[PDB]
Design a protein around this ligand. Sequence first.
Ligand SMILES: O=S(=O)(O)CCS
Ligand code: NA
Ligand code: NA
Ligand code: NA
Ligand code: NA
Ligand code: NA
Ligand code: NA
Ligand SMILES: [Zn+2]
Ligand SMILES: [Zn+2]
Length: 259
Amino acid sequence: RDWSSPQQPFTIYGNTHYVGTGGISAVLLSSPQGHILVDGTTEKGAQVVAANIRAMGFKLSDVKYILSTHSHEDHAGGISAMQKLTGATVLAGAANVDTLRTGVSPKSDPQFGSLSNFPGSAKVRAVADGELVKLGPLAVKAHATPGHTEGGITWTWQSCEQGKCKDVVFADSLTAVSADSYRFSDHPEVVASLRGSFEAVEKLSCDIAIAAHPEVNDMWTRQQRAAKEGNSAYVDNGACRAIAAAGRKRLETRLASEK
Ligand SMILES: O=S(=O)(O)CCS
Ligand code: NA
Ligand code: NA
Ligand code: NA
Ligand code: NA
Ligand code: NA
Ligand code: NA
Ligand SMILES: [Zn+2]
Ligand SMILES: [Zn+2]
């Protein structure tokens, strides 16, 4: 379950499908009008994402938007390739837009250096905090969740299965992790952002959470159980609270270990 490993795709809930790798989340939100893909995984994972979308019985040319959580290589490395395969527009938080266009992080990024560069993407533009991305029946809201990077966006929508509608959250990473030489102790505004983000996330309406790192909300456990109990296995409305709490506890640990 490394970041580029093949993973048989599956429906999470209604028109929300998992089409990511074994280690990195990507989600296809489908409609008879076209689809929104969230994240591209790694540069080598892109070929997994593309194969997974086709295996779910969709066409790459029907993907009209690609949404980015944040611009690290493990989530965004595959986006240029996916953009080229789909023709999509790529949406991202203002502060990550340039990284996606060039594939080069800013030196403000906790993992500048620590992760390599990756292919730059065409057809990127910024979303605003609060902005609604629309496509036919689909409506996805951007929520600014900076800190892990400056332009992090957590994305939300509603999916309905057999008349039962749930609030889905694709949770950007809330983790105080970095290059070995980067210190969160030396970047108080990054720390403050993170703290703001914990709070934003734990307030979200959150029936189904998909974490950018899928095991952060137990994806593989839930998915095995979905065989037995159906897609209720993914539903758990404390999930966003737990992700935020984990982030918060991780930050406190990190700051201490630094000093
Ligand atoms: O989680 S890792 O810091 O290993 C990858 C970047 S989000
Ligand atoms: Na696969
Ligand atoms: Na399925
Ligand atoms: Na399933
Ligand atoms: Na973003
Ligand atoms: Na959940
Ligand atoms: Na069910
Ligand atoms: Zn990251
Ligand atoms: Zn990551």
